[PDB]
């Protein structure tokens, strides 16, 4: 039940160095093996590198070997990934993982890293308001980079909620909608609020959805 947690910048400018840290809880990094893995959006998995907690030796994918460095801090039970000279090809969810032999037995939750020179921008949020069933929504527009999280009624409303994947618009900014279906008889009694969180801009938006 070891837990791993990746942390680092969600947006890195091209040619700069991407640095990520993996915090390990419940296990000493001084034994077994530890790896970094990445997955570009909508693509497969690629092994980056591994270090041996016992001997400190490292091993790297030849497709990245020249650009990749791994350092460890037994004091904090953390290890890091350093990837220099990044381009858009390095945009991906990065995972850290524990290995006993060759398999990736435990994984972190993963951190999305976008490589772009575009600036961070918080979202605009607009209500979507309109039988037996009604639909309500929120349009989350013009933000960068991914991701945003959307909840309804502070996370107490989950049944019937659909939050769609973001589309990159021609403006270079992301947009998405989150919707929920509710009984029309509830429209006069229950209030509906969509809660939007955009960590890269440290923005939080709550939007009451009203029928006019």
């Amino acid at each position: 039940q070891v837990q791993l947690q990746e942390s680092g910048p969600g947006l890195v400018k091209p040619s700069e160095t991407l640095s990520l840290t993996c915090a390990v809880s419940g296990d000493s990094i001084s034994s077994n093996y530890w790896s970094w893995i990445r997955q570009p959006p909508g693509k497969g998995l690629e092994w980056i590198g591994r270090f041996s907690g016992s001997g400190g030796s490292t091993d790297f994918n030849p497709s990245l070997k020249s650009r990749v460095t791994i350092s460890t801090d037994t004091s904090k039970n953390q290890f890091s990934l350093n990837l220099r000279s990044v381009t858009a090809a390095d945009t991906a969810v990065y995972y850290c993982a524990k290995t006993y032999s060759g398999t990736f037995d435990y994984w972190g939750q993963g951190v999305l890293v976008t490589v772009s020179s575009a600036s961070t921008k918080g979202p605009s949020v607009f209500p979507l308001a309109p039988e037996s069933t009604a639909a309500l929504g929120c349009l989350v527009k013009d933000y960068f980079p991914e991701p945003v999280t959307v909840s309804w009624n502070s996370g107490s409303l989950t049944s019937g909620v659909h939050t769609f994947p973001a589309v990159l618009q021609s403006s270079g900014l992301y947009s998405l909608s989150s919707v929920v279906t509710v009984p029309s008889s509830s429209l006069g009694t229950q209030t509906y609020v969509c809660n939007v969180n955009h960590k890269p801009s440290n923005t939080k938006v709550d939007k009451r959805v009203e029928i006019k």
Partner: protein, 213 residues
């Protein structure tokens, strides 16, 4: 060096079906092969190690086998919880390499979409750019056609579609179609409608609103 070729890339199967996924290594990997199950938005989960050994807690309907340099993952009777993308991975030698993955989706009965259209808010009109959202809720199969009509005339330039993953309960999909217009363009027409055709609909359904009403 060792390259894993996974087959097939995608699959559609019904509950109770027997599904087999095959993975080929370009060289001999000596049974050092793992299978992973990845749910959308989640990290991969190991299912099988050393080609045929089950990870602890994995249901017995999952099994792996080998015939020479060919490795197979088999689900004896597919269950609702088994929808995911599956990956093979060799660890005979460095660099460790993965197959491209196999998407797995569940077949179900045809389900017609419920359709909703959302007028833009006045706050949005004030921004100079307007988005009109049409929602198709809980339908199957995935294939659907959404037509935008403005004052009865078909508009085909300014819309984008987005589809959810298959729902974990009812195995349906949902879809949004968003028509983006400048505020000037939006204010020069009255009737905005989305017309949806789907295999579950006896006749096409259109939802509309009148701008400024």
């Amino acid at each position: 060096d060792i390259q894993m070729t996974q087959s097939p890339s995608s699959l559609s199967a019904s509950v109770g079906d027997r599904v087999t996924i095959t993975c080929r290594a370009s060289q001999d990997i000596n049974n050092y092969l793992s299978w992973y199950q990845q749910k959308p938005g989640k990290a991969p989960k190991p299912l099988i190690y050393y080609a045929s050994s089950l990870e602890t807690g994995v249901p017995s309907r999952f099994s792996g086998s080998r015939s020479g340099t060919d490795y197979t993952l088999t689900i004896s009777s597919l269950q609702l919880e088994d929808f995911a993308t599956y990956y093979c991975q060799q660890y005979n030698n460095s660099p460790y390499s993965f197959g491209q993955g196999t998407k797995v989706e569940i077949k179900r009965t045809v389900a017609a979409p419920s359709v909703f259209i959302f007028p833009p808010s006045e706050d949005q009109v004030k921004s100079g750019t307007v988005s009109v959202v049409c929602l198709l809720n809980n339908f199957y199969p995935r294939e659907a056609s959404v037509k935008w009509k403005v004052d009865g005339a078909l508009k085909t330039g300014n819309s984008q579609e987005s589809v959810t993953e298959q729902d974990s309960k009812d195995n349906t999909y949902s879809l949004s179609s968003t028509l983006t217009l400048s505020s000037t363009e939006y204010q020069s027409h009255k009737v905005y409608a989305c017309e949806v055709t789907h295999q579950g609909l006896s006749s096409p359904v259109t939802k509309s609103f009148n701008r400024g009403e």
